[PDB]
């Protein structure tokens, strides 16, 4: 309000600092993760009714109306996006496409500003049809309070708890896709990260080791589906007669290999319950020589990379990268926080 | 103040030392995905195997202890046909899995070579003539 009264100012040409520019873009986005986390903090001890259970302030309301309806925190989180949109649209536009998306960060933010574009335009679908079918009990509807009248089906599906949601509907989308975002949004905390002495060169070194180990589980994976598809076929032909139901299908065959990884898989996937007892020693075998396989490649990559690390040249890289977040924010136009450069 | 434990207490204070600044990284991927899975399962109380992720604090235990292997798989899935919301509670715990051991891998090879940068004697012997000269003064008689 401040910038907007008076632009030309102590406040105005303090405000127009580069530090404080990125002073303010990191506390728009710390106002960002507070909004998803307030958003949730009706739950943060866990629901009280039961997902089969449907509660409503009035009882002419259809429940999905009262599921689906957006708060004011929604509303603001919505402005948000539409804020942070607005900005990378624009610095795509000004900058061009093809260096925009050859850029980590610019494509995780659009990524994730996409996935919160799309599950809200997933929840505003569902709150479109909860509202159509309120209006439909609100014009059409004078039992005394949905307990007597019958609703057609079209619209007796919204009176469903949690439990008869088709596994499609709109809002399991909406909410699904609103918790990857929210998952994906703090890992723009490393964006701001290197602008600090203690935190830069560790991101930097980090993200040296995830472009370091991509070339190694690029390998992991061939191996990964070598066996994945040797063990979906010695186990295909026991759905019923597994002890797990492991390794039965291409899916199951994928849990089963890839939570083998962190141990997280028991020994009785490769178990029958049938006296074919070939087929399982050979599943033991495969299984063995997958885990011993898997525990080489983990050994080859963490020696390798040991190496590479091997062969003052971090404190060089993260400067650099601190340079490239300061000429980024020198020029004048990035001025206001992307929720409130909306307004001109 | 012995000779052949005290620098191995100082190697074990400086791994503290290091492994903090990779933690406070590690925290914040942490509560990135605690957050994001229970706003995924915050929904699915009685609708669960178990109570994984359907707590703040029920999703940071989880969390915590699948750095150790100790969470079950289990915990993602759920009772009801909702499979859209089970996969992507399946890829991120899986994303998790992966980026923390990425973060510890990245920490070991860090350390590691900070650690290849008769050093830690000066250090151990340094430690062990300030514990003698906290014994020199005549007041800690007893
Ligand atoms: C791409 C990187 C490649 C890495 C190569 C890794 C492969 C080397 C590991 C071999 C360990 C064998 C790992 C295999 C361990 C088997 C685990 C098991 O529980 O089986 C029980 C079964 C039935 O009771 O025992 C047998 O019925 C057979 C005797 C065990 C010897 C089988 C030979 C396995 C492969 C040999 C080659
Ligand atoms: C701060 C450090 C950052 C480190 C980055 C780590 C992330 C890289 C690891 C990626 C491994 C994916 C790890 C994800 C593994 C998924 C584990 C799982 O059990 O899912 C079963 C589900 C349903 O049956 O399968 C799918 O429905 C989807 C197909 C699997 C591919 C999903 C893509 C996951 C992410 C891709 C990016
Ligand atoms: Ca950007």
């Given at each position: 309000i401040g910038y907007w009264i008076a632009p030309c100012s102590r406040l105005g040409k303090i405000l127009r600092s580069p530090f404080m520019k990125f002073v303010a873009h990191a506390a728009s986005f710390i106002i960002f993760l507070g909004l998803l986390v307030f958003n949730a903090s009706d739950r943060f001890?866990?629901?009280?009714?039961?997902?089969?259970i449907t509660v409503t302030d009035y009882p002419k309301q259809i429940f999905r109306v009262k599921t689906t309806q957006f708060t004011w925190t929604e509303m603001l989180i919505m402005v948000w996006v539409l804020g942070m949109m607005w900005s990378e649209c624009k610095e795509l536009w000004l900058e061009g496409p093809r260096e925009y998306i050859l850029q980590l960060w610019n494509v995780l933010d659009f990524g994730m500003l996409s996935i919160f574009i799309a599950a809200f335009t997933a929840r505003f679908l569902a709150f479109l049809q909860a509202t159509k079918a309120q209006q439909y009990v609100d014009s059409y509807v004078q039992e005394s309070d949905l307990s007597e009248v019958t609703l057609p089906p079209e619209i007796q599906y919204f009176t469903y708890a949690r439990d008869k949601w088709?596994?499609?509907?709109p809002q399991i989308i909406s909410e699904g896709l609103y918790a990857i975002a929210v998952v994906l949004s703090f890992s723009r905390i490393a964006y701001i990260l290197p602008a600090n002495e203690s935190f830069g060169p560790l991101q930097i070194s980090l993200g040296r080791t995830v472009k370091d180990i991509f070339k190694f589980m690029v390998l992991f994976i061939m191996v990964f589906f070598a066996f994945m598809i040797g063990m979906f076929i010695l186990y295909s032909y026991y759905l019923g007669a597994?002890?797990?139901?492991?390794?039965?299908t291409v899916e199951e065959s994928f849990k089963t290999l890839f939570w083998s990884i962190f141990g997280l898989?028991?020994?009785?996937?490769?178990?029958?319950?049938?006296?074919?007892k070939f087929i399982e020693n050979i599943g033991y075998v495969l299984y063995g020589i997958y885990n011993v396989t898997m525990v080489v490649v983990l050994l080859n990559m963490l020696i390798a990379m040991i190496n590479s690390s091997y062969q003052d040249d971090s404190d060089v890289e993260w400067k650099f990268a601190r340079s490239k977040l300061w000429l980024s924010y020198f020029?004048?136009?990035?001025?206001?926080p992307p929720p409130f450069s909306l307004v001109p």
């Open positions: 001890e866990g629901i009280t009714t039961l997902p089969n088709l596994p499609s509907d597994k002890v797990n139901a492991a390794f039965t898989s028991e020994v009785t996937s490769v178990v029958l319950k049938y006296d074919h020029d004048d136009g990035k001025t206001l």
